[PDB]
Amino acid sequence: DDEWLQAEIARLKGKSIVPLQQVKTLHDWLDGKRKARKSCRVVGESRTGKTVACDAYRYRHKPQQEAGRPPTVPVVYIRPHQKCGPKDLFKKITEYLKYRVTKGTVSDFRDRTIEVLKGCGVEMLIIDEADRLKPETFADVRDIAEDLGIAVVLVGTDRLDAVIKRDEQVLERFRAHLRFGKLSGEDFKNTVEMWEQMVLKLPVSSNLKSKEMLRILTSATEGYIGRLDEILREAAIRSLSRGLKKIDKAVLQEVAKEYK
Template sequence: MLHNFVIVLMWILSVAVPSTNPGDTPQRQPVIETSSVKRFWRSMKLALSLRNQYDPKADDALIVPVYGKSGLGKTFAIRGFIDSISARTVTGLPQVITVVVKHRATPKGLVKQILHALGESPRGREYSDIVDEVIDAIQGHDISMFIFDEADRLDEETFECLRALVDETHRPMVLVGLPNILKIIRLHRKFKDRVAFGVPFEVLDTDEFLDVFLPKVVLPRWIYDASNDSDRAMGTFLWERTRPVLRRVRKVLNLASRIVLIDEEKSITQKHIEEALKKILTDDDEDDDENNVTEDEEERPGAHEDESNRRQDAKRKSRPNRKKRT
């Protein structure tokens, strides 16, 4: 009797609680080592080497801007670089500190952010007092370098704040953001002279997207073989509709993964990607990167302007010279 009861109970549980495939559990996405990410990591090592511990005042060009359009994976690249650094300071803090610049940051708010990133709270109220605390904390913890993400949010005042900290602490500072971060640097020699080198964060080409990026994506029911023609066709279909924004790729695949799980299908196919695209891609999504242009790009005439100028030139050349009336 008891045996039969146990069997019935197990059957009820198996129906009421569906079995969970370990592969269906969302996992943390490892940083995918694309060529852009590898170039970024190499540049960060170069930036770290700029610090001259033996003669700190020998060189004050310690600012490194890293610029690229939104959604290319800059923040992921930062995370991967930070994770790769095992070295700690004398007080146990990471050798490299990351700060995400807040919207409409003020100089006072920015130095407070830096202080909090160092595990400390401001004691003073005045901006100058907090700056002194930041300088003491950087030197006391022996921090090697700072990386400021979303650095395109910096304005002239907050940029001046970082320049002053560079001059006082002689630590390299990496500024990661959209291409318009270059505008403020170009406009002011005092900032431009502090730049050691710049790092463009480049867009993936199609082959690298298909051969390197997609095979490393970690999502439930995502099975991709770069050597399989149908998988490559699916990947090409996805890239043609999302390029160059990797964040958008992840967004589409994440929704497609959820659709597959709900429908209890084996793996993500192109039909699931098509459904996900229809649900999340709007005209606004397509245009969200158009404003992320550099100063040079803003001044450069577009294709329509070029064509119009050519037509006007042709008309002027073909127009006969009229004699002036006397």
């Protein structure tokens, strides 16, 4: 049972992907853009479910490689490091395509990146956290989208919009957008119960996320999916660590106070 307890904390520790309306709308939108080689920017709030949705979109299309040829990777997802220069972006791109870099000058990296990017038949390049990369590499992402006909989707906090706003063409080129929903309302109530069954995975305790727990969670999370996830996992881990089989109102008040 302590073996089972180790299973429980490890399983609750790792995150899951519970499919809700947000990620489905995002996938539909991204399919629409990718069929049209259209570069959009999918902006949203922070702690709201953007990176997970882009990852899910990256996975449903896992590259199916020909028996002996370079794998046709339709969607490429990279999330650059802080102040990603043009060299670093190319390193990340050609790394995700699983071509190790040969040491060279920025131009050599650019040339090799274009070569493996046309070779692997990339259709969409999702740059997550695209407010990090420097203004002098938006020129190269513009170049990629400009010549290879690749739908570049810049993901990022609202800060990304101002980041593209002070530049001129990036703002013109990346103008189709899709704001992440806040999720508040009856749909938020569904999500709450959806987390109980899908992710929490506990023997049914007849909790049912009643208006009390819902008031607590609307009070605490403010609608952010992260916050829903962080709070519920913490409460579950706490309750199982103290022997409680289900989640009490006590531990819910605990995590509520220790956030706000």
